[PDB]
Amino acid sequence: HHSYTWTGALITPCAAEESKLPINALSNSLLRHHNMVYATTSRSAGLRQKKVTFDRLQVLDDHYRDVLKEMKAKASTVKAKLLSVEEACKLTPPHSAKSKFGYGAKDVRNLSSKAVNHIHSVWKDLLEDTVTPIDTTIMAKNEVFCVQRKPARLIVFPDLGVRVCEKMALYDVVSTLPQVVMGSSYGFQYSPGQRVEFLVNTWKSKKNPMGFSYDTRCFDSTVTENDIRVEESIYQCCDLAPEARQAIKSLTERLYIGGPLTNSKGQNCGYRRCRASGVLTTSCGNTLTCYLKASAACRAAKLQDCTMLVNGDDLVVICESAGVQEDAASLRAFTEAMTRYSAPPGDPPQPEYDLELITSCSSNVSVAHDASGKRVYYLTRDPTTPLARAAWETARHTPVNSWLGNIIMYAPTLWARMILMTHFFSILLAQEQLEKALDCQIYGACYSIEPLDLPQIIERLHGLSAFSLHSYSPGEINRVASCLRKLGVPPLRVWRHRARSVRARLLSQGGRAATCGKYLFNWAVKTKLKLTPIPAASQLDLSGWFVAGYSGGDIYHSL
Numbered sequence: 001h002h003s004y005t006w007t008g009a010l011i012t013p014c015a016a017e018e019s020k021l022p023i024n025a026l027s028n029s030l031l032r033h034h035n036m037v038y039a040t041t042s043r044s045a046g047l048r049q050k051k052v053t054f055d056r057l058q059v060l061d062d063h064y065r066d067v068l069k070e071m072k073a074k075a076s077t078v079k080a081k082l083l084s085v086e087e088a089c090k091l092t093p094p095h096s097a098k099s100k101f102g103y104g105a106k107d108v109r110n111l112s113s114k115a116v117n118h119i120h121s122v123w124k125d126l127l128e129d130t131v132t133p134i135d136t137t138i139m140a141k142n143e144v145f146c147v148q149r150k151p152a153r154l155i156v157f158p159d160l161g162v163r164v165c166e167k168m169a170l171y172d173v174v175s176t177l178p179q180v181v182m183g184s185s186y187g188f189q190y191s192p193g194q195r196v197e198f199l200v201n202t203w204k205s206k207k208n209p210m211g212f213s214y215d216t217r218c219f220d221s222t223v224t225e226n227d228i229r230v231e232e233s234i235y236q237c238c239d240l241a242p243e244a245r246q247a248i249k250s251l252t253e254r255l256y257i258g259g260p261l262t263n264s265k266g267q268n269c270g271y272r273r274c275r276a277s278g279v280l281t282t283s284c285g286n287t288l289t290c291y292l293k294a295s296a297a298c299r300a301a302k303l304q305d306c307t308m309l310v311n312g313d314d315l316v317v318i319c320e321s322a323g324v325q326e327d328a329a330s331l332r333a334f335t336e337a338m339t340r341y342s343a344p345p346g347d348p349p350q351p352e353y354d355l356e357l358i359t360s361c362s363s364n365v366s367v368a369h370d371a372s373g374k375r376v377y378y379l380t381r382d383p384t385t386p387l388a389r390a391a392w393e394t395a396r397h398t399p400v401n402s403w404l405g406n407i408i409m410y411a412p413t414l415w416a417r418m419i420l421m422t423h424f425f426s427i428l429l430a431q432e433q434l435e436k437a438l439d440c441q442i443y444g445a446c447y448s449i450e451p452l453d454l455p456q457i458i459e460r461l462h463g464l465s466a467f468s469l470h471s472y473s474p475g476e477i478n479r480v481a482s483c484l485r486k487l488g489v490p491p492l493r494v495w496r497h498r499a500r501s502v503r504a505r506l507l508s509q510g511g512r513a514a515t516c517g518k519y520l521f522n523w524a525v526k527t528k529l530k531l532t533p534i535p536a537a538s539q540l541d542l543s544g545w546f547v548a549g550y551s552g553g554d555i556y557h558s559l
């Protein structure tokens, strides 16, 4: 029951790989300690392979089956539709990996005959063949981090033609089934503010609240064939067209459960028997399985009033404390149950009695004060990785602009406002690219967004209070202070100075640009303004922005 088997062929790159942080005339103004930032490359693929390769064992008890029966009952109320070839094509990222069959994402988005015909043939084959394993490409991802070095993560994905077929058969399913099955516990249905709101209200719902985060060790590799078949059984509970059921069964047997791994050079690297990280069902599948195992585990551990929050493999549990000594014991039982279900912990889970001390999705709840001085909760996170990536994107253009996604997601934070906004608007100004649309990601889905719309976007997501938060917590303040000293990032006084400059320049520009200067940097001036709702704020269509997770699902949405 090994997660992977290898032939010995190396996981190769499909282009040039940089490890050291690229430096340009702008680097120093943001970060001086350049050696602490690095990018993971294929060179460390071998190390990752050893970590993700192990034997899985599963002992499924009655709690497991009891929870599953419940999940299926909810899933049976779901009705999902097949997406047309055109609709699926539209969801394909302009820069998605091209097909090995004479066409690329551009041809797919354009509905070229060649692309449409191959997709139809791939679909036909899925209906007629439910046994032959589908080929996948294994690659080492190039991600940026701050030292203290980790081996590159692996990404396994099927060909473009297959990815479009996954959309047709399962897009509607993975977009609507999770919230129906898990209710308020499905994390991807919330915007950052709504996530904090749910966490806060949940924590208050308890007489004596207690909570903890549970980090599974290499979750993808712990997903067994059984887990993937159980996932399919859940999808099949939905009201689906017979053609969709066949396609889902086929995709499960031939791709989701496992298959051969091929490097960029076309050499067989081995075989997979665990979760593929680059398929449409990755996020929904992990979310369902994690929720199923954790739910069953809570019962086995006898935790009282268990409220969960799941986002793929990230898990948050808030419940009624049965006492400090009892909580620590119950948690140990939880871990033991999760382990029996093939989901051992990476790091020992610890009970917390302070909401702000629980970290999940690399985030945590914190509190500040709005213009009225009222206590306001918001989502933040350790800025280390965002800043390292911001440094990289400062001297290198990338497919995904993490700084933009981070501003949108953490707009209310001290670090995003003082540093990210100031630094990058200064850059956008100097190059006059404020109106240029940029790609970023939100819950795994790719979105093309223009910087000029940030004020509106942030207002809709976080409200006007995002532009006026102050008096952050000492804990947050010092975590940011530490990070800046570690990376060698200039202090507040410097950023405030730059913000006034950036702010003044934006105000001069006028229109959309002035709005950015007025709202985004109102904290830079000594005498604040009023800051009132933005007229075009409602015009924005943020409908499918916070509905589901699509990490590795090759999903696109143009704003």
Ligand SMILES: CCc1ccc(/C=C2\SC(N[C@H](C(=O)NS(=O)(=O)c3ccc([N+](=O)[O-])cc3)c3ccc(F)cc3)=NC2=O)o1
Pocket: 371, 413, 414, 415, 416, 417, 418, 419, 468, 469, 470, 471, 472, 473, 477, 478, 480, 481, 482, 484, 492, 522, 523, 524, 525, 526, 528
């Ligand atoms: C890493 C070390 C560090 C830097 C900043 C802090 C802590 C801060 S900064 C702050 N507030 C200012 C701010 O709002 N100033 S004001 O002039 O807008 C202001 C001051 C007082 C009030 N008031 O109501 O009393 C309102 C607004 C700030 C917010 C966002 C940002 F990116 C930088 C600085 N509150 C805090 O706890 O720690």
